[PDB]
Amino acid sequence: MKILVIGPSWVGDMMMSQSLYRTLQARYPQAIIDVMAPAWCRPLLSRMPEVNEAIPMEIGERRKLGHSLREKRYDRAYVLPNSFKSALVPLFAGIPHRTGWRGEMRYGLLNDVRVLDKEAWPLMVERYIALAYDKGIMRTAQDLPQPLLWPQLQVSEGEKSYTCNQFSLSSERPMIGFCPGAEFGPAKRWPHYHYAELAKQLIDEGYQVVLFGSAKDHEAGNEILAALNTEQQAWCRNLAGETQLDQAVILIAACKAIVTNDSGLMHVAAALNRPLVALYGPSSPDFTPPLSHKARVIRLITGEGYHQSLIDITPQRVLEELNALLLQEEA
């Protein structure tokens, strides 16, 4: 059962796609899954045991790429992105069965198009999982065989140990991880100064802080550090842009808890089953909530700058929620 998957180009979405891979291996015997995604995605995929290989990635190129995949003789293909062009490769590869939601009217590239009823499939994870089943079977998420297979990542003590040294982190104090960035824009970010105040409070409690993010979040990490004194800065490390996704996964796993905005790394922490506090403002967790029993969501409202709803969430409120989850973990 050779399967080719066109994976999404966002950390969050990629993490969610693991549910499809887990479901495919539970519903099909000897399912070999290859995933095609940007280069920077390879690290995350390498942490998923369900993935066999990460196919390394314009019209003229897409055809050549697709032609080279003919040798693989893929039995099936699943296109996760919604873009029209994303379903081109599978066709050029000559794959007989190509599945995916309609998206941008992919009636040609997909001979097994699924018409999406947003009300019938409220969660993104349910939408990915549904693709592993035959078309005329699932009408709503309630029809999905339970329990659903949520994203899940494992990390060994040896990995955590080495990686912490690889990034010059001290073992003399437990770590709390912060993910101050947000792919959907500044409006969804808890203020840099609130993260700084929270760090001061945590360092005072005996913890050390680590900031995770992409190269783009590096400046944000520095603005947070610039708000701490010398003594505190010694216990706050900015790793935004310094790690590959595989290293980020390992380090997040090594943290006692994580504080993050509605972003892709939130999903990574959730998959690792790490205690986490997710801060929401203009957006809601209705579509892509953190899938973990150890996660807590804080949002004060319903429904290029910061949003009042996030500015109104005080570091003290977050600290209280955090210390509670940290206690549970110790007990």
Curated annotation (Swiss-Prot):
The keyword Glycosyltransferase applies. It comes from the Bacteria. It is an enzyme of class 2 (transferase). Keywords: Glycosyltransferase, Lipopolysaccharide biosynthesis, Transferase. One of its GO terms (cellular component) is cytosol. Pathway: Bacterial outer membrane biogenesis; LPS core biosynthesis. Disruption phenotype: Deletion mutant synthesizes shorter LPS without the outer-core oligosaccharide and cannot produce flagella, demonstrating that flagella assembly in E.coli depends on the length of LPS. The keyword Amino-acid biosynthesis does not apply. It catalyses: an L-alpha-D-Hep-(1->5)-[alpha-Kdo-(2->4)]-alpha-Kdo-(2->6)-lipid A + ADP-L-glycero-beta-D-manno-heptose = an L-alpha-D-Hep-(1->3)-L-alpha-D-Hep-(1->5)-[alpha-Kdo-(2->4)]-alpha-Kdo-(2->6)-lipid A + ADP + H(+); L-alpha-D-Hep-(1->5)-[alpha-Kdo-(2->4)]-alpha-Kdo-(2->6)-lipid A (E. coli) + ADP-L-glycero-beta-D-manno-heptose = L-alpha-D-Hep-(1->3)-L-alpha-D-Hep-(1->5)-[alpha-Kdo-(2->4)]-alpha-Kdo-(2->6)-lipid A (E. coli) + ADP + H(+). One of its GO terms (biological process) is lipopolysaccharide core region biosynthetic process. InterPro entries: Glyco_trans_9, LPS_LOS_Heptosyltrfase, RfaF. Pfam families: Glyco_transf_9. Active in a broad range from pH 5.5 to pH 10.5. One of its GO terms (molecular function) is ADP-heptose-lipopolysaccharide heptosyltransferase activity. Its EC number is 2.4.99.24. SUPFAM superfamilies: UDP-Glycosyltransferase/glycogen phosphorylase (SSF53756). Glycosyltransferase involved in the biosynthesis of the core oligosaccharide region of lipopolysaccharide (LPS). Catalyzes the addition of the second heptose unit to the heptosyl-Kdo2-lipid A module. The analog ADP-mannose can serve as an alternative donor in place of ADP-L-glycero-D-manno-heptose, but with lower efficiency. Belongs to the glycosyltransferase 9 family. This is Lipopolysaccharide heptosyltransferase 2. It comes from Escherichia coli (strain K12).
